[PDB]
Amino acid sequence: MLSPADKTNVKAAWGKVGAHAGEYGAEAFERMFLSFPTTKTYFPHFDLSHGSAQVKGQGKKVADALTNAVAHVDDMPNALSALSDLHAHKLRVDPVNFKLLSHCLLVTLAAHLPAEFTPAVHASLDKFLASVSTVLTSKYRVLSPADKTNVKAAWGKVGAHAGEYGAEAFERMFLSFPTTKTYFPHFDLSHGSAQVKGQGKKVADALTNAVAHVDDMPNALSALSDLHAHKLRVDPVNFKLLSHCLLVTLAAHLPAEFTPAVHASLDKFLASVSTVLTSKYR
Amino acid sequence: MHLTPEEKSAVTALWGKVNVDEVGGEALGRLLVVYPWTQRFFESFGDLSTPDAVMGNPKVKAHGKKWLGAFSDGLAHLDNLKGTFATLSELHCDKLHVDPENFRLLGNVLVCVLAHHFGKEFTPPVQAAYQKVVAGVANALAHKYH
Amino acid sequence: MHLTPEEKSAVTALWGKVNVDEVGGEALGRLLVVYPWTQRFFESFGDLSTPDAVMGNPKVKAHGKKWLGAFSDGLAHLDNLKGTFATLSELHCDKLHVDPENFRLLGNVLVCVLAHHFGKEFTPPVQAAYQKVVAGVANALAHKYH
Numbered sequence A: 001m002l003s004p005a006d007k008t009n010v011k012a013a014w015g016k017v018g019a020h021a022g023e024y025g026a027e028a029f030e031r032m033f034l035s036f037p038t039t040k041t042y043f044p045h046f047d048l049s050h051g052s053a054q055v056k057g058q059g060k061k062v063a064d065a066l067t068n069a070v071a072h073v074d075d076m077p078n079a080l081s082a083l084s085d086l087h088a089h090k091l092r093v094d095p096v097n098f099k100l101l102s103h104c105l106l107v108t109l110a111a112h113l114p115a116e117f118t119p120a121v122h123a124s125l126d127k128f129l130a131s132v133s134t135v136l137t138s139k140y141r142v143l144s145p146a147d148k149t150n151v152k153a154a155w156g157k158v159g160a161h162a163g164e165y166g167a168e169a170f171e172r173m174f175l176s177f178p179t180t181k182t183y184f185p186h187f188d189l190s191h192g193s194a195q196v197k198g199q200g201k202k203v204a205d206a207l208t209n210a211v212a213h214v215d216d217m218p219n220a221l222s223a224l225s226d227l228h229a230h231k232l233r234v235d236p237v238n239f240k241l242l243s244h245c246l247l248v249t250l251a252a253h254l255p256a257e258f259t260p261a262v263h264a265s266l267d268k269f270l271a272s273v274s275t276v277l278t279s280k281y282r
Numbered sequence B, C: 001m002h003l004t005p006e007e008k009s010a011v012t013a014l015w016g017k018v019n020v021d022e023v024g025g026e027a028l029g030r031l032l033v034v035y036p037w038t039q040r041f042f043e044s045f046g047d048l049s050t051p052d053a054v055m056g057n058p059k060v061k062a063h064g065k066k067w068l069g070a071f072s073d074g075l076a077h078l079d080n081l082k083g084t085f086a087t088l089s090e091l092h093c094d095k096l097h098v099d100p101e102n103f104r105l106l107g108n109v110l111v112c113v114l115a116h117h118f119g120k121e122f123t124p125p126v127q128a129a130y131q132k133v134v135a136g137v138a139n140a141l142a143h144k145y146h
């Protein structure tokens, strides 16, 4: 969410950008193409030399959309709906790339707005661009009634084993992605550890609660959202690693139930849980 | 790349049991269903609108055979993945224009499929070894991008 | 990593204009403000309640000097980053428990701070060179994690 203060900061900053928005848009893409050359894979049809009309035109269109977004900051999904459809259904840019363009737009503004780019305004602009990116990728895949049905079917089949599977998921995570161990320095992480079994059951129980409240997850998970944002402070990238390891765990235990369509529904459900758990971080 | 004796033994033993034909099509199919924006590279494969349509698509199965075959020949050269995949790296960048992020996604789905197919035999330490390998292959395939 | 000679000179040329103690405190301060979950390591530093408390915090400013001076020294060893930072890597994993994702965040906040400080002088190619260096430093600090 964008605080009221955030919105005020973005408007001030973007107002300063003024009639330069297009130029700055073209600059941000040029910086991205140079710093992160994999992003050029989405523009093979473009002359990407410096100052090309295609790049300038892209920068201007992107700039117009951000202005639109800023002017309708309390109604972004609706304001950008045509743009979210287009990226989800036609362009199909991998979501990671939105982070990269956001970083280069931040660099561009920093380089052109010495007076205005204070720490707080930096913070607000970053949050704003993350919000835009979220909106632009929102329709790539809300859980449909089929997803909801699939998630209840598979989780119902986990049943009393929920806790054991949560523990296995953490063990898989710790072995596969050793950096996640940095959040548990106070634990015995050996195989069989009762501390890891206890962690697994608590997470499993929370997931059971989320399945039961699949249409009211922000409230059902609100105390846990608080705890991770303000106390535990787990970097958001780690939630994706645990989600992959829960999927692997379910796959190895539910051969008949883990169909392609159920796998897709589970991946969407864990991403939504992950979104809710990191929603109060900033 | 570097793997302990235990890690390489785990990878090697499991792989002896993999039907490359079937696992390759399953993994690519699930990629297309779970991350549908990846369908952008396969517009000529025809109908991929539903999971069932994707999984039974003949061009999906055939291409499945193709990529996992090259993956398997990679497992015979785990000490020089970059040299092994150099030409295909170039091909995916300059000719196919594939965002390297997709290599990581396909890597993770393959791991999911190995778990699904092998169940309890796909233990946490065997998964760990396979996650190293898939990351090393993704890194090798992205190496020549410019 | 491995930079061209022209990228090295560009990195070196701009760095001669940096006030290491000031920029170090500013980049650490903005990290803590923009990504407040990183505050989890610095609870002993005192008041971090608002951006001004943070930017004005003397313990933040002192730690700023510390980390960016080690960074600065690493610019002299761009051909041996992994070797230059091996001990620091071990320390951050085994004793400090710092998720390496934080090094990438700080790297990107440093780039923002440089752009803010040097304006038009921080050109797209100079940024590209710095993006490589901060990724290289992040990778080298993450190298000994186990």
Ligand code: HEM
Binding pocket: A039, A042, A043, A058, A061, A062, A065, A066, A083, A086, A087, A091, A093, A097, A098, A101, A132, A133, A136
């Ligand atoms: C803040 C994020 C973004 C915004 C606001 C945005 C907006 C837009 C807009 C308004 C268009 C043109 C629509 C039209 O002409 O019908 C467009 C096109 C496009 N966008 Fe996005 N975009 C964003 C991020 C990205 C990213 C990260 C990439 C890829 C690295 C990307 C790649 C493309 C492509 C390939 C096109 C088509 C260009 C053409 O063929 O003319 N977009 N974008």
Ligand code: HEM
Binding pocket: A180, A183, A184, A199, A202, A203, A206, A207, A224, A227, A228, A232, A234, A238, A239, A242, A273, A274, A277
């Ligand atoms: C979507 C996945 C997750 C859910 C639903 C979840 C849920 C929970 C729950 C229910 C608790 C216990 C709170 C209590 O004591 O009442 C907890 C604690 C904790 N979580 Fe999360 N968690 C998730 C992801 C993660 C991830 C990915 C990490 C870090 C890699 C993490 C790190 C922790 C830590 C460090 C604790 C406290 C352990 C202790 O010292 O007792 N969590 N979480």
Ligand code: HEM
Binding pocket: B038, B041, B042, B063, B066, B067, B068, B070, B071, B088, B092, B096, B098, B102, B103, B106, B107, B137, B141
């Ligand atoms: C483990 C990673 C991968 C390996 C080892 C691999 C390998 C290969 C090989 C050997 C070919 C055959 C080229 C030819 O004979 O013309 C190929 C083609 C292709 N690959 Fe990759 N690939 C991988 C991942 C991906 C991913 C993730 C995507 C896209 C999401 C992709 C998309 C394509 C496309 C579009 C073709 C051409 C298909 C056709 O011409 O019908 N590849 N790949």
Ligand code: HEM
Binding pocket: C038, C041, C042, C063, C066, C067, C068, C070, C071, C088, C091, C092, C096, C098, C102, C103, C106, C137, C138, C141
């Ligand atoms: C390229 C990035 C970084 C470099 C070069 C660096 C460097 C250093 C140095 C030189 C020390 C002192 C070691 C000693 O006491 O012998 C240190 C300590 C420390 N660093 Fe890092 N660091 C970096 C990033 C980070 C990040 C992003 C965090 C956390 C968000 C962090 C957290 C800490 C903590 C908690 C200490 C201990 C300070 C104290 O005990 O007073 N470091 N760092």
